[PDB]
């Protein structure tokens, strides 16, 4: 009878999924972020909060009465600064895709070369930028990631984050600590304490049980980032299990017993349980397809493909020059020649070549030290093309299928469940 709520705060709106213990969906829904008042110093944060309340309201009351645990994900490196005593958000959030170049040299002056913080969009660059604006009483401020802040709205215990959200500020999930080069700086006093994703923080606040009818013993758990929640939704849990996201671009994630980080290729690892999620991202993918054909042309041409026969066409499908993974060449040219007169042959060549690139990506992760890929689940638009699925299975020489669930909010609900089970 106990249910488990996960929310996903994405780039333009929030979503929620409520599951039972067996992962069956009892309720789900979405809301776009409302506008905020021009004068609101909170900016987008005020909207996010509104969305939180809206989503909670959207859950059927009979479903809310059964919800035993809550987790949620948010966007990576979306950074808020609060006064520790009042809880006041001291400025507009630093959004996931917002950069603080002004802080990057200082960060490079304390962090290891090619550490993942050494990027203008990193949480740490944002922290250092804010710090250096010398706000009065800044030493009484605290940093929260988007997810941490929304969760804190729910449980009332200030300053807790997770292994995943905290990565871009410099937290090391392997030693479960912030490194001395970070702790040696005064803004380190703003850093949140860090737990594993999907672990209990505290009971849901009485305000929410009173207003929405959640049971008194409902708990609130740490979250994760939306990318990782989305991966979790697939329920790939063993090393060698992989999820390929086939969308506008191509991105892969591979579960591994061994941590892998390599700046040459932009390869980075997050911690999950006792494992490492190793990610890599290519500029190839569906964008060039839809650039070349209509969606109607795409499915109609797809129906004419024999996926069990390989294309002789060697393409590197790109819209413009440049690749970082699985080839580190910022000048890498698109290759779409020769283009056969048959659009079916052309399409087959593109799909097959993207499969080649995907395979090469998994091989590179393996060569960098990851557990070798054994099976590939598929997310993104590309997943609904079964001809492409069969092509990929043949070219990769591995079993390939659709992931069953891919929504971040579904993965967040799995974290809520994990937290409840652990807490029990």
Numbering used by the authors: 11 to 434
Article, verbatim:
Apo-AtXK-1 exhibits a folding pattern similar to that of SePSK in line with their high sequence identity. However, superposition of structures of AtXK-1 and SePSK shows some differences, especially at the loop regions. A considerable difference is found in the loop3 linking β3 and α4, which is stretched out in the AtXK-1 structure, while in the SePSK structure, it is bent back towards the inner part. The corresponding residues between these two structures (SePSK-Lys35 and AtXK-1-Lys48) have a distance of 15.4 Å. In contrary, limited increasing of ATP hydrolysis activity was detected for AtXK-1 upon addition of D-ribulose, despite its structural similarity with SePSK. Structural comparison of SePSK and AtXK-1 showed that while the RBL1 binding pocket is conserved, the RBL2 pocket is disrupted in AtXK-1 structure, despite the fact that the residues interacting with RBL2 are highly conserved between the two proteins. In the RBL-SePSK structure, a 2.6 Å hydrogen bond is present between RBL2 and Ser12, while in the AtXK-1 structure this hydrogen bond with the corresponding residue (Ser22) is broken. This break is probably induced by the conformational change of the two β-sheets (β1 and β2), with the result that the linking loop (loop 1) is located further away from the RBL2 binding site.
